[PDB]
Chain A
Amino acid sequence: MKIQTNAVNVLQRTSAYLKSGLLKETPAWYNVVASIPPSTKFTREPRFKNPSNGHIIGKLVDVTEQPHANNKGLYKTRPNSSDKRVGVKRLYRPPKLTYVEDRLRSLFYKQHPWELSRPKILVENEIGDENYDWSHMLQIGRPLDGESVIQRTMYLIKTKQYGDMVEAYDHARYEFYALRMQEETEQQVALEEAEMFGSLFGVSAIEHGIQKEQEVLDVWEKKVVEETELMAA
């Protein structure tokens, strides 16, 4: 669609109507819209910096900036073909946002596929209210998940307690293992205590799965016997 003129100039048309005498009474919105001018510029704006990683867009390194040879052993003496092409599209494209965590996360759920099965809630609660110190993995108001491992890894690297990504990742992983072992032991011991003290449970996960399997299998029984009868003829 073309940039539309009529939507934002309603005040001007109404002013013409009023001054000409075509309209006698000012609309209630007239004074408000006059006090608050609509934004009447619709321009594609250049972007020179990628916020996610800080890469600077629109920079060319001149020949003079290299007084030494490159990896192949060649001095840069003249611009090459790619350097001699105007890159306005690079300025006007929306920059792709890339984060380091996105890699480690992909590693973590590759290393621990069953951690994916633990349900996640994407409803944000309140982002601004987060007050976390990442010297320790467990945070109040937060679950214990792989993202905690990546956050602890980034905290470790930021403080330079460890140097390489792998080392901090491994340390956070081992803290994660300890904490999850503790939680598993709490769950097992709690169930054992409940059975120790007379608690009676109507249904368990195995029996629930067996029940659902039984319904599905009964329907499948009916359908298979009917289909065998149909196919025989």
Chain B
Amino acid sequence: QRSLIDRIQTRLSELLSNDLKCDQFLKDHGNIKKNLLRKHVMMDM
């Protein structure tokens, strides 16, 4: 549980840091973007 929570949070922070990387993540998965990124990152994990 702790690993899952920490990994989710660190990946969210990393992708939020680079906004373009977030858009690339969104497009590969195929403030609205914030929620979409959160959903995709948790679905990844």
| Interface 1/0 per residue, B1-38 and A, CB below 8 Å | 01001100100010000000000000000000000000
Provide the residues of chain A in CB contact with B5, threshold 8 Å. 75
Q: Is A67 an interface residue (CB 8 A)?
A: yes
Minimum CB–CB distance from A63 to chain B (whole Å) comes to 13
Complex-state Cα separation, A68 to B13, whole angstroms: 12
Complex-state Cα separation, A75 to B4, whole angstroms: 13
Provide the residues of chain A in CB contact with B9, threshold 8 Å. 67-68
Interface residues of A in 75-94 (CB under 8 A from B): 75
- Chain B interface: which size bin? under 10
Which residue of A is nearest B13, CB measured?
A67
Provide the residues of chain B in CB contact with A68, threshold 8 Å. 6, 9
Provide the residues of chain A in CB contact with B6, threshold 8 Å. 68
Complex-state Cα separation, A173 to B42, whole angstroms: 59
Minimum CB–CB distance from A2 to chain B (whole Å) comes to 53
| Interface 1/0 per residue, A45-68 and B, CB below 8 Å | 000000000000000000000011
Complex-state Cα separation, A75 to B13, whole angstroms: 17
Provide the residues of chain B in CB contact with A67, threshold 8 Å. 9, 13
Complex-state Cα separation, A28 to B38, whole angstroms: 77
Which residue of B is nearest A75, CB measured?
B5
Provide the residues of chain A in CB contact with B13, threshold 8 Å. 67
Complex-state Cα separation, A68 to B12, whole angstroms: 13
Which residue of A is nearest B10, CB measured?
A67
Minimum CB–CB distance from B9 to chain A (whole Å) comes to 5
Minimum CB–CB distance from A73 to chain B (whole Å) comes to 8
Minimum CB–CB distance from A64 to chain B (whole Å) comes to 11
Minimum CB–CB distance from A140 to chain B (whole Å) comes to 56
Minimum CB–CB distance from B14 to chain A (whole Å) comes to 12
| Interface 1/0 per residue, A19-30 and B, CB below 8 Å | 000000000000
A-side interface residues toward B, CB under 8 Å? 67-69, 75
A sample of 6 cross-chain residue pairs with beta-carbon separation below 8 angstroms, ordered by A number, consists of: A67-B9, A67-B13, A68-B6, A68-B9, A69-B2, A75-B5
